[PDB]
Design a protein around this ligand. Structure first.
Ligand SMILES: Nc1ncnc2c1ncn2[C@@H]1O[C@H](COP(=O)(O)OP(=O)(O)O)[C@@H](O)[C@H]1O
Ligand SMILES: Nc1ncnc2c1ncn2[C@@H]1O[C@H](COP(=O)(O)OP(=O)(O)O)[C@@H](O)[C@H]1O
Ligand SMILES: [Mg+2]
Ligand SMILES: [Mg+2]
Lengths: 371, 81, 291, 186
């Protein structure tokens, strides 16, 4: 029996069959509702477009994100997301396949209660599992120990794990990730005269962010280079055919990851979050975490983030020992890859959560079972 | 007798460069930097002392005992009455 | 993504392509314990009934001198990594000391700084001096004009553009002195000494081991010990050049006359390039204002 | 000397002298170009009517608004607006009088660059200043802190101000004001 791995992230749901390398179904988690009036009677005008249909027809759709800041706020939208990812994308019965799921650190318990009750009452499964995203990312990195900076669409959380023991007190969370970068990119594009106010325009600005933005290695030198010469300006074609050109906004937008005072947050950058996570660990195991800085999440896809990250930690940490950044090319799907690693294990048959365990112990055995 | 010690005095008072003075016997050692420079054959660049002297030398009035910000706020506060 | 037999034969064969430092650290941290080895040796049933973990542990136990072999893998990759990080930095340190001891435009520059300082502090106790320490080059940017825009170093590089521009070729001699060491030399020296001690212990253990391990690993151990001995010769040369640099700058060798001179000189060369850049910006902005 | 205040608003330009409580020259920001065929000889009729003159004779004029959503579209029309308010309404020489300007938040910066270039080259002034309109609205109330909802003719913007310091990240903008209400009423 093939299991299913389905990371229900804040940004994009990534699902597929276990024992595989790549997720078959990657699609954004939006629920699109029409805001205008229908006049054309017939042809299946369905009232709530989900996923890729909501992405394609997005010019008449108010888009809602069910997962906001790593928390499932809207639940009926999340049920529609789960219905689309099981029935339309994978096209598999839930009652004959195990389904691995993922979760953010320091989550509310009633969130886990509700996800367990949906995964055992509505979408009945033989077995399922909830894991921390950083733990699965460390598993797909092939190492039992290390510190994981996972930066999704709403949450950038730092989790150090030593020998499979995820340290709970040293985990911290910073609410600054990709959607905040998209909103800041909407704000700073109005200096060039481009207005993006609708939720349909958020996907266009997000595509601009995905395609053109990059992490500066030194911010002040990139200010000097951008103000001096217009060599780093890059042009983008909008879906209506218009072409914009952006300059310093390719690297002022990810610099919010290192300077949260741009959007007005008193907390420092992700480097200081990583370093303050490191001092919360034991002094014996800090050496291993320095050489094992693993990243995951698509907010780490900018092609200057590793060298800048190593520079920031090496500035922060003492230079007596070694600093190393673990940045695999497939760290976007490393949550899914670690789930596929964990699902097809011979030991993992005895850590499954059965329906009999659900019936005996409510939707509450996930607290005492999982970390 | 060395070339660098031949210093014309400034008419105006000059700003002081702060450094810890090396003793003259130590700087005139054979392994030192400055034994090669005390010789007259070395290239001693003449500084422009005129430029250094130019650059490195030393209604009734509303008298207020307050800063401009608090006076600005008080004037904005008072003119609404 | 392969069987237990292939990684077992790769450990036995001495192949280090899929075995970096972290994987071997995990393997040493997942070493078998005494009761596990004894239970697998006392296991008498069919070995297909065991798990793949137990089958891998039996394949690991089938390898003679397997822990010593894994130590050889880890010490070879660690010695290679230590040499790759330390040796170009130590070569930069040696080239830094060699081009600090001999310089061409630097006596002319420091003589000019001494002339300007004797002009500024004339009549004081510091004036009429034959020289100063190397820390004065850091203190050149401290003294600053009436307009609070031009420092002393910025003024010196402004007048040196028009009078004697060969001083502008001064960082060309100081580029192997540039970027300093980056890290402290004593800590990586202790790491190199510990690595050399571990490699000598490993060669003594391999010499106590079988001839297969000898033919597999002794030439790599000898090459690593020879490279680390060349590195220790380089460290002794750095110590000799450190004593030469201490006697060159008229400072006692008991204080830090090696890393502090690199940091002082690196910051001074960065201030040299920054003062060059700001004087070029001042000249360009004055030209733009004149236009 | 006596300073000038010229709120160059999106629908109406309010100009006057400093120290005063009533703005001396309040006139709409329009440019009226004729569209029909003239048959009088005698000249007199201009090719562009600006301000109240365009309002009075509006039955034969195409009216162009130079400012759209707090953004100056046609710079020649806005130059004509500035020339009319400096030379005809207020009747002051620009090079002997300080002049305070107002600008909406979150504007494109090149609009501010071009306004600075016109006010320092064409109508060159001894001094000027560009300031946020909600700040001056709070200064009219006699208080130092508070939030101002300024709903003009092109931009409705919210600015909270604490101790005379406008908080930049919390300022928001909405392109819905009196011209859009006029179009919806139409
Ligand atoms: N190639 C890319 N370059 C920059 N950013 C990206 C790229 N791909 C994805 N992202 C950003 O990272 C996020 C990827 O989502 P992911 O981390 O997989 O799950 P979630 O963020 O929903 O928890 C998206 O929200 C997107 O904004
Ligand atoms: N008495 C009024 N009642 C309703 N609306 C008015 C009144 N006076 C002005 N307005 C509206 O306000 C607009 C002018 O607003 P104003 O304060 O000049 O904004 P701005 O300075 O940004 O142009 C006009 O277009 C008009 O539609
Ligand atoms: Mg995710
Ligand atoms: Mg207004």
């Amino acid at each position: 029996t093939t299991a299913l791995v389905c990371d229900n992230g804040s940004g994009l749901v990534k699902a597929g069959f276990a024992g595989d390398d790549a997720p078959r179904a990657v699609f954004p988690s939006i629920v699109g509702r029409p805001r205008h009036q229908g006049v054309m009677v017939g042809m299946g005008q369905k009232d709530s477009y989900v996923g890729d249909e909501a992405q394609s027809k997005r010019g008449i759709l108010t888009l809602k994100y069910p997962i906001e800041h790593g928390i499932i706020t809207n639940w009926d939208d999340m049920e529609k997301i789960w219905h689309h990812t099981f029935y339309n994308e994978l096209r598999v019965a839930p009652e004959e396949h195990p389904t691995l799921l993922t979760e953010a650190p320091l989550n509310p318990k009633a969130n886990r209660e509700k996800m367990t009750q949906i995964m055992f009452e509505t979408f009945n499964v033989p077995a399922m599992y909830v894991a921390i995203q950083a733990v699965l990312s460390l598993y797909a990195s092939g190492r039992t120990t290390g510190i994981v900076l996972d930066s999704g669409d709403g949450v950038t959380h730092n989790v150090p794990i030593y020998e499979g023991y995820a340290l709970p007190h040293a985990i911290m969370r910073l609410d600054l990730a990709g959607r905040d970068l998209t909103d800041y990119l909407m704000k700073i594009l109005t200096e060039r005269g481009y207005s993006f106010v609708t939720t349909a325009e958020r996907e266009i600005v997000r595509d601009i962010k995905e395609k053109l933005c990059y992490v500066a290695l030194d911010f002040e030198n990139e200010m000097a280079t951008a103000a001096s010469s217009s060599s780093l300006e890059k042009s983008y074609e909008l879906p209506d055919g218009q072409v914009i050109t952006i300059g310093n906004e390719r690297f002022r937008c990810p610099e919010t990851l290192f300077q949260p005072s741009f959007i007005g947050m008193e907390s420092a950058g992700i480097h200081e979050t990583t370093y303050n996570s490191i001092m919360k660990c034991d002094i014996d195991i800090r050496k291993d975490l320095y050489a094992n800085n693993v990243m995951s999440g698509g907010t780490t896809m900018y092609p200057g983030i590793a060298d800048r990250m190593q520079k920031e930690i090496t500035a922060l940490a003492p230079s007596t020992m070694k600093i190393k950044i673990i940045a695999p090319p497939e760290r976007k799907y490393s949550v899914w890859i670690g789930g596929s690693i964990l699902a097809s294990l011979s030991t993992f048959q005895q850590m499954w959560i059965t329906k009999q365990e659900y019936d005996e112990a409510g939707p509450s055995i996930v607290h005492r079972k999982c970390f | 007798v060395p070339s660098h010690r031949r210093v014309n005095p400034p008419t105006l008072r000059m700003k002081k460069l702060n450094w810890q003075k090396l003793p003259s016997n130590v700087a005139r050692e054979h392994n030192s930097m400055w034994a090669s420079l005390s010789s007259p054959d070395a290239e001693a660049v003449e500084p422009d002392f005129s430029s250094i002297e130019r650059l490195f030398s030393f209604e009734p009035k509303e008298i207020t005992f307050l800063d401009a910000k608090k006076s600005l706020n008080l004037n904005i506060f008072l003119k609404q009455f | 993504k392969c069987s237990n037999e292939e990684v077992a034969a790769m450990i036995r064969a001495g192949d280090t392509t899929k075995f970096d430092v972290e994987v071997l650290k995990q393997l040493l941290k997942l070493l078998p314990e005494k009761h596990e080895i004894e239970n697998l040796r006392a296991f008498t049933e069919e070995r297909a009934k065991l798990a793949s973990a137990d089958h891998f542990y039996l394949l690991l136990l089938a390898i003679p001198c397997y822990q010593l072999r894994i130590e050889c893998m880890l010490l070879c990759e660690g010695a290679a990594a230590v040499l790759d990080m330390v040796r170009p930095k130590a070569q930069l340190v040696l080239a830094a000391c060699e081009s600090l001891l001999t310089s061409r435009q630097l006596p002319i520059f420091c003589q000019l700084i001494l002339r300007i300082g004797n002009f500024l502090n004339y009549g004081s106790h510091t004036g009429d001096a034959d020289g100063f320490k190397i820390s004065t080059l850091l203190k050149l940017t401290e003294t600053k004009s009436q307009q609070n825009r031009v420092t002393l170093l910025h003024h010196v590089l402004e007048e040196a553009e028009k009078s004697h521009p060969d001083l502008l070729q001064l960082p060309r001699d100081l580029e192997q002195p540039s970027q300093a060491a980056g890290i402290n030399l004593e800590i990586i020296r202790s790491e190199a000494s510990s690595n050399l001690k571990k490699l000598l212990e490993t060669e003594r253990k391999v010499s106590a081991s079988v001839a297969e391990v000898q033919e597999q690993y002794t030439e790599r151990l000898q090459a690593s010990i020879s490279a680390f001995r060349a590195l220790d010769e380089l460290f002794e040369a750095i110590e000799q050049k450190q004593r030469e640099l201490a006697d060159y700058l008229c400072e006692d060798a008991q204080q830090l006359s090696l890393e502090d001179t690199f940091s002082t000189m690196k910051a001074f060369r960065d201030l040299f390039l920054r003062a060059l850049k700001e004087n070029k910006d001042r000249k360009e902005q004055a030209a733009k204002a004149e236009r």
